[PDB]
């Protein structure tokens, strides 16, 4: 629900945080467009593993210290087409433990 906003042509910011079991004990994260599906992300835009980011493109990057578990996302230069629900998924290990965050971007 909580609308996140940006004007066309701005960078957008979407917050997503998780807590590492311990510093430099990282958990796979993914952002996609569309709400979180059953597994991982729909239309991945960015994917990390335990070590680092392993998938991305130019428009999407992690703007923060993801090694401390700030996996908030920036989107380069938004068009109206970038409007919608973005999934941020923390693939916490163990049974059915995923943390799923849907964040609604709205582009004036």
């Amino acid at each position, epitope marked *: 629900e909580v609308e996140y906003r940006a004007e066309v042509g701005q960078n957008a910011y979407l917050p997503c945080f998780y807590t590492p079991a311990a510093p430099g004990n990282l958990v796979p994260v993914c952002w996609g467009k569309g709400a979180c599906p059953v*597994f*991982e992300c*729909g239309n991945v835009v960015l994917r990390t593993d335990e070590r680092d980011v392993n998938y991305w493109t130019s428009r999407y990057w992690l703007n923060g210290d993801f090694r401390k578990g700030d996996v908030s996302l920036t989107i380069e230069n938004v068009t109206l087409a970038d409007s919608g629900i973005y999934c941020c998924r923390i693939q916490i290990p163990g049974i059915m433990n995923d943390e799923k965050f849907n964040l609604k971007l709205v582009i004036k």
Partner: antibody
Amino acid sequence: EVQLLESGGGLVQPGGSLRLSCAASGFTFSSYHMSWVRQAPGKGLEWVSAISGSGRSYYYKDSFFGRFTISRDNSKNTLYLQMNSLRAEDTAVYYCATSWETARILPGAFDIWGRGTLVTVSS
Amino acid sequence: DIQLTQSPSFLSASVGDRVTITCRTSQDTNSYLAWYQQKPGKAPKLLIYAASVLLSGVPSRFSGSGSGTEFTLTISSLQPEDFATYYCQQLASSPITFGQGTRLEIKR
């Protein structure tokens, strides 16, 4: 050729245990969600279990809570299901499956299946 | 669990026919639906996923549409080899669930 080859299927008494294996070839195993999906003879498709690429995240349908454990050995390119407390109605063909072509849009859409291995729960 | 109800359960149709199979979901499933085609003694073959997207290899005479709670698989120009039980599958919420299946036999 992306290939999944289950084995371990066979006859097992109710209450009994069975480990299924799935051998994966022809792709980078350790970067793909793996699922088990099952099908009683003549009947429909039931998703059982999934596991993350890394093999540290596990997923289950409620019916398998506590009974079934999914694991992978990425170095052996092999997927496992440990099935405990098996029941007659667990009698089915067990497929492993992955999202390969699909992964970049919708994981869990299974473009790649195995042959199936039949598990029979009977006295 | 999200229930998927397919209709019809059974369909008999002549080569060249246009046939649609509907799948209704008990909750909003977004676009997170897949269509599979299972021939006897074989594993399901994925035809369509994300509602509308054809797997490479799949004849363009297969098509999907819909979103939310109602989804359609359409086979135009039905062929004999299109005999199969067809399943929808939702990928919106755990557990993954399928429809009961639609069996399509070829009138002849």
